[PDB]
Symmetry: C3
Subunit: 90 residues, 3 copies
């Protein structure tokens, strides 16, 4: 298992001092469809955005989705048992 | 939760005029184990391949495995309840 | 489903051949909150560390966490069915 907590990249949403523009931006769809080439060069915004999206979704999967799915699993069984046992007592 | 739909990097596979090669190529396992070092500058194919990996698999997890899993658990609970219902009916 | 058998990037933990420092290092939270700015010089250490984190956390979820949850669901359903079966037999 992974040994360390999962940090987000460029978590904050602020204007960078060097640029004065938001630290993250969506890459243009055309670039997503194909990616970089020899001559083409990466921009800071897209670079930060990709890693930020990856880390944020990893958080949402690990620390959010599984815990609540487990809680729902337990709750479903508890409610089913209650419903059945009511009739059984009847 | 994050407010952007998961976009798979380099989803399409095509030849790039700059390289003439497929947009994604598998890094040699030596590099996978090792990684980069100062002075190295990545080849576009490996970069695209890695990002496509990390994005496509998160997309799969979010949009295929879970929507399947909640439906499956719900159906399992419903079928167990149904069976107990036929058992009670008599 | 993705065709890629995901692999861990920089899975080996050794010092760099040209630099005595390790091949991976956690970026300072200062950078994690902001992201690379104009004119910054990315180091292979941070790139390798983040890719390692992402890849390891993806494959852990894919290969371990889901089979565990499925086995737990199956066992819970079987035991729950058995309880009511026994009680209705009584």
């Amino acid at each position: 298992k992974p040994k360390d907590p999962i940090y987000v990249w460029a978590a904050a949403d602020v204007n960078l001092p060097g640029t004065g523009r938001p630290n993250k931006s969506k890459p243009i769809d055309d670039l997503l469809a194909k990616g970089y080439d020899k001559g083409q060069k990466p921009a800071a915004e897209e670079f930060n955005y990709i890693l930020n999206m990856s880390s944020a979704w990893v958080n949402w999967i690990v620390n959010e989705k599984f815990p609540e799915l487990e809680a729902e699993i337990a709750r479903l069984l508890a409610e089913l048992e209650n419903r059945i046992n009511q009739q059984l007592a009847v």
